[PDB]
């Protein structure tokens, strides 16, 4: 009977169910349209239209009533429908939502809050039914988003527009434009963008404003920027001119990055930032705090023997307090940011830090897709961090899985459950293909280049535990029949799921993962043959063993030889384990 609360992302801070729910009518009364946030109303109109829900011209008391507005708008209908629930005591971007007895109230703390209230409403409604809930909600972290800051083919204009919509839908409010292989960002940073590219930029800025996203325009001048004399003045004016060109199209957030460069002129880097902050940021008056990243940006690079290194010390002492400083954690690509690391670096800089999290980015190990949740990031990090971003894959569509979880982590940090969030991300993104995509993506969460880059949740941990249990059972001389049968089913399911994804995934997703799907099919076949080897030894069948051995070997060799990389420590490793296995040594 009772209408259940569907999947929500981010998880709202406070949600109480206070009723059995109700069906929203074929047409609705909309109150507060003209006074409420324009972008919130546009998003609401889009949703209603897309779900065949008409807006009434005149009030119909038989129709459902939706009341929308901000706390500073005088809407008595909103106050009545809210019934004591308030948004005024909530932080910026916060909102209140109350659905009760054919009335939905949405009250933002501000215009951004009202917009995010609409996003929750959009997720609450399934087949015109809505639960009866009392919500007050607001972000843990002030700035939440993406930094397109990877090497490789930059995202297409269409990728970016789609990403911006997606960020709005999941309450992510920051998009930093800084692709390493854009010549006009970095290599040829002084040169103005072509008109065609400037028109694309304008479209991105408009889409960002439409979805409450701060478009942050990045510039990376550190390769060859000159600091002193007339050359210094010429180059600084190039930064201003470039920034001005994007300011004039609507950009109100800026980043100047010093990462991955030869030059470590600490004072000079900070002085360029301070001058830009004085002469541009403070000058314009409506520009958000300047963002940067120093040349030392991971703790290994920044700290030695618990003390800052020379560059970091000078940069920290020189750089203006208002400037947002990014760092990546203990390493460039690392397992965790524990609370002690954030404490250390925040202490050195004497400010709340910004995070450039290098997951799900795969530019260092392009064969594998990073399809796992936010993992290893301390749930108290908000104590020392006010700005959280992820560096995504060049593969924009499949980056959404990990980004979806980052929205949950950054908005509701204290209740973040990586496993539940990961499942929720695939459920909400893939729909009817969600269960099959889970089977595939479960094998492609761990990033490990075998040396310096290690991050993410382990691949297929439940399957790996069962594989370990097989070897233990065999050594203990127990009957492994039931476990072997279970594993045959697991490996069959991997093949079945991937074949269904090849047949039915939309091309936008399939074009990014087709080789990885084939890779996991090949490994699954090798895994099946690996079980055949074990069963053959148990039955003392040499012919059957040698036949299963050559298949297992061929499948492993193909997997190892191919560009695609997946399930290294689970599906791939199991074949190697099974090839080594000699039952006569038990």
Binding residues (CB under 5 A) for Ca ion: these are: 35, 70, 73
165, 364, 464, 569: which one contacts its own copies (CB under 8 A)? 364
What are the two backbone dihedrals, phi and then psi, of residue 563, each rounded to the nearest 5 degrees?
-65, -45
Out of Cl ion, its own copies, Ca ion, none, what residue 506 binds, judged by CB under 5 to 8 A for its kind, is Cl ion
Residue 150 interacts with, from its own copies, ligand X1A, Ca ion, none (CB under 5-8 Å by kind):
ligand X1A
Per rule CB under 5 A, is residue 514 in the interface with Cl ion?
A: no
> Are the C-beta atoms of residues 140 and 100 closer than 8 Å to each other?
no
Name the CA radius of gyration of the chain, rounded.
27
Q: Does 245 bind its own copies (CB under 8 A)?
A: no
Q: Give min distance, CB of 141 to Cl ion, in A.
A: 13
Among the candidate windows 150-158, 291-299, 441-449, 505-513, which touches Cl ion by CB under 5 A? 505-513
In the β-sheet with 54-55, what is the strand arrangement from edge to edge? 14-17, 133-137, 95-100, 103-108, 64-70, 27-31, 54-55
Residue in 506, 511, 540, 542 binding Cl ion, rule: CB under 5 A: 506
Token readout for 289 is: 């705090």
**Size of the chain in residues:** 586
3-state secondary structure 130-151: ECCEEEEECCCCCEEEEEECCC
- Closest approach of ligand X1A to the CB of residue 475, in Å: 8
CA proximity to 295, closest of 324, 266, 336: 266
CB–CB of 67/143 below 8 Å? Answer: no
Return residues touching ligand X1A (CB under 6 A): 149-152, 259-260, 293, 297, 328, 332, 356, 358, 361, 363-364, 391, 584-586
For residue 397, what are its two tokens?
């569509």
CB nearer to its own copies: pick between 78 and 578: 578
SS3 call for 313? helix
Both structure tokens of 258: 């010093």
Here's the x/- map for its own copies, 399-438, by CB under 8 A: it reads as ----------------------------------------
Please state the closest distance from residue 87 (CB atom) to Ca ion, in A: 13
**Residue 580's binding partner, choosing from its own copies, ligand X1A, Ca ion, none, with beta-carbon cut-off 5 to 8 A by kind?**
its own copies
Which option in ligand X1A, Ca ion, its own copies, none does residue 274 bind, with CB closer than 5 to 8 A by kind? Answer: none
Residue with tokens 């434009």: 177
Residues in contact with Cl ion, counted by CB under 5 A, come to a total of 4
Q: Does 432 bind Cl ion (CB under 5 A)?
A: no
CA separation for the pair 191, 198 (Å, rounded): 12
**Least distance from ligand X1A to the Cβ atom of residue 498, Å:** 27
Please choose which of Ca ion, its own copies, Cl ion, none residue 561 contacts, taking the beta carbon within 5 to 8 angstroms, the exact cut-off set by kind: none
Which residues make Cβ contacts (< 8 Å) with residue 489, sequence separation at least 6? none
370: its two tokens:
């990073």
Residues near its own copies, by CB under 8 A = 298, 300-301, 331-333, 363-364, 449-453, 471-478, 576-577, 580-581, 585-586
């Amino acid at each position: 009977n009772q209408v259940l609360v569907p999947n929500l992302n981010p998880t709202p801070e406070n949600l109480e169910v206070v009723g059995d729910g109700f069906k929203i009518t074929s047409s609705i009364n909309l109150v507060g349209e003209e006074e409420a946030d324009e972008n919130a109303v546009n998003a609401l109109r889009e949703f209603l239209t897309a779900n065949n829900i008409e807006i009434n011209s005149e009030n119909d008391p038989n129709s459902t009533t939706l009341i929308i507005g901000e706390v500073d708008d005088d809407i008595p209908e909103l106050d009545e429908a809210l019934n004591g629930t308030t948004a005024e005591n909530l932080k910026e971007e916060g909102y209140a939502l109350v659905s009760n007895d054919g009335k939905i109230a949405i009250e933002g703390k501000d215009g951004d809050g009202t917009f995010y209230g609409v996003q929750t409403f959009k997720q609450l409604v399934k087949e015109s039914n809505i639960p009866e809930v009392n919500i007050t909600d607001y972000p843990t972290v002030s700035a939440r988003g993406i930094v397109e800051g990877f090497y490789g083919t930059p995202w297409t204009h269409q990728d970016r527009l789609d990403q911006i919509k997606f960020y709005g839908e999941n309450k992510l409010n920051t998009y930093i434009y800084a692709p390493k292989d854009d010549p006009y960002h970095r290599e040829k940073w002084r040169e103005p963008y072509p008109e065609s590219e400037m028109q694309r930029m304008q479209e991105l800025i408009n889409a960002s404003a439409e979805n409450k996203v701060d478009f942050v325009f990045g510039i990376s001048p550190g390769i060859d920027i000159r600091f002193d004399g007339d050359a210094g003045e010429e180059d600084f004016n190039h930064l201003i001119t470039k920034a001005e060109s994007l300011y004039d199209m609507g950009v109100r957030s800026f980043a100047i990055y010093w990462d991955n460069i030869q030059d470590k002129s600490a004072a000079k880097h900070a002085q360029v930032l301070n001058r830009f902050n004085e002469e541009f940021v403070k000058a314009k008056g409506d520009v958000k705090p300047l963002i940067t990243c120093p040349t030392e940006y991971d703790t290994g690079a920044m700290v030695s023997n618990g003390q800052p290194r020379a560059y970091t010390r000078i940069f920290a002492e020189t750089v203006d307090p208002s400037i947002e400083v990014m760092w990546t954690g203990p390493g460039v690509v690392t397992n965790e940011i524990p609370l002690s690391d954030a404490q250390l670096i925040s202490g050195i800089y004497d400010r709340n830090m910004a995070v450039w999290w290098n997951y799900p980015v795969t530019d260092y190990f392009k064969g594998k897709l990073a399809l796992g949740p936010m993992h290893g990031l301390d749930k108290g990090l908000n104590q020392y961090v006010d700005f959280f971003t992820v560096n995504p894959m060049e593969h924009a569509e499949l980056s959404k899985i990990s980004i979806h979880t980052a929205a949950d982590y950054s908005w509701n940090m204290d209740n973040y459950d990586y496993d539940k969030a990961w499942n929720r991300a695939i459920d909400m993104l893939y729909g009817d293909l969600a269960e099959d995509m889970k089977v595939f993506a479960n094998h492609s969460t761990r990033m490990d280049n075998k040396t310096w880059a290690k991050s993410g949740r382990e691949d297929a941990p439940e399957l790996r535990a069962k594989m370990d249990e097989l070897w233990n059972k065999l050594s203990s001389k127990e009957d492994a029949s039931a476990l072997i049968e279970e594993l045959y089913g697991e490996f069959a399911r991997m093949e079945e799921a991937c074949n269904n994804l090849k047949a039915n995934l939309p091309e936008v997703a399939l074009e990014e993962c087709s080789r990885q799907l084939d890779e996991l099919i090949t490994l699954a076949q090798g895994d099946k043959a690996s079980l055949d080897m074990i069963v053959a030894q148990l039955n003392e069948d040499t012919e059957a063993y040698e036949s299963a051995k050559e298949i297992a070997q061929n499948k492993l060799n193909t997997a190892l030889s191919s560009f695609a990389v997946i399930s290294e420590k689970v599906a791939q490793s199991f074949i190697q384990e099974a090839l080594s296995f000699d039952l006569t040594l038990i």
